[PDB]
Amino acid sequence: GDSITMEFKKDSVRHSCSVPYEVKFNPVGRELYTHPPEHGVEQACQVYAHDAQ
Amino acid sequence: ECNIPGNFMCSNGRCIPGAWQCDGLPDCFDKSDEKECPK
Amino acid sequence: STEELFNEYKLTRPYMARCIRCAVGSCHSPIAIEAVKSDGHDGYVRLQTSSQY
Amino acid sequence: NTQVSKAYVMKSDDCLADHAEAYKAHTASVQAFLNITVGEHSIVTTVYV
Ligand SMILES: *[C@@H]1O[C@H](CO)[C@@H](O)[C@H](O)[C@H]1NC(C)=O
Ligand SMILES: [Ca+2]
């Protein structure tokens, strides 16, 4: 997408905020996909760990 | 493997946040993240 | 009324299948879509899911 | 451990209505519809060429 919008419901009218930032993730490998396939081969990549460590 | 590292492997092989390991919620859906949890 | 509405549903039962992404990673969920057809000219989609309703 | 995978190709369920038909044609004949009036005799004639 072209921008990121975040929102949550308060005890009243819902609040939202949009900030301009270029979001464009490079597909892993020499094949340009939009979503990961059901099946494929395992290749090395660099990703954000969710671990709080 | 999964989002290395932190992904505690469940009994069914699903990956959960390591902050949800032993947090009192059934995130694996088989209770394996909440079993054997140390005190 | 008629077996088309009575349906073989009584014999079948919904089932589960693997999705590529279930939000945070893959999972064996009944929502899994087996196939999608897009031959209609009016823009309607015919999705075949692993569950029944 | 052994995991056997099997797959095959089958016609789509939509093919019955949405399909192309390949024909071969030759030796064409022409059929014409002439309005012929001969001496105040108006008729509608369907006749080949
Ligand atoms: C010729 O054909 C048209 C319609 O096919 C008809 O209305 C008309 O009366 C005909 N004319 C003569 C002279 O037969
Ligand atoms: Ca948990």
From Swiss-Prot, chain B:
Limits of the LDL-receptor class A domain: 1-38
Localization: Cell membrane
Annotated coiled-coil segments of the chain: none
Expression tissues: Expressed in the cerebral cortex and hippocampus.
Disulfide bridge positions per record: C2-C15, C10-C28, C22-C37
Family to which this protein belongs: Belongs to the LDLR family.
Record's subunit section: Interacts with APP precursor C-terminus. Interacts directly with ITCH; this interaction promotes ITCH auto-ubiquitination leading to its degradation. Interacts directly with NEDD4; this interaction promotes NEDD4 auto-ubiquitination. Interacts directly with NEDD4L.
Function field: May influence APP processing, resulting in a decrease in sAPP-alpha production and increased amyloidogenic P3 peptide production. May regulate ITCH and NEDD4 E3 ligase activity and degradation.
Protein name, as recorded: Low-density lipoprotein receptor class A domain-containing protein 3
Species assigned in the record: Mus musculus (Mouse)
Segment of the intact protein contained: 28 to 66 of 345
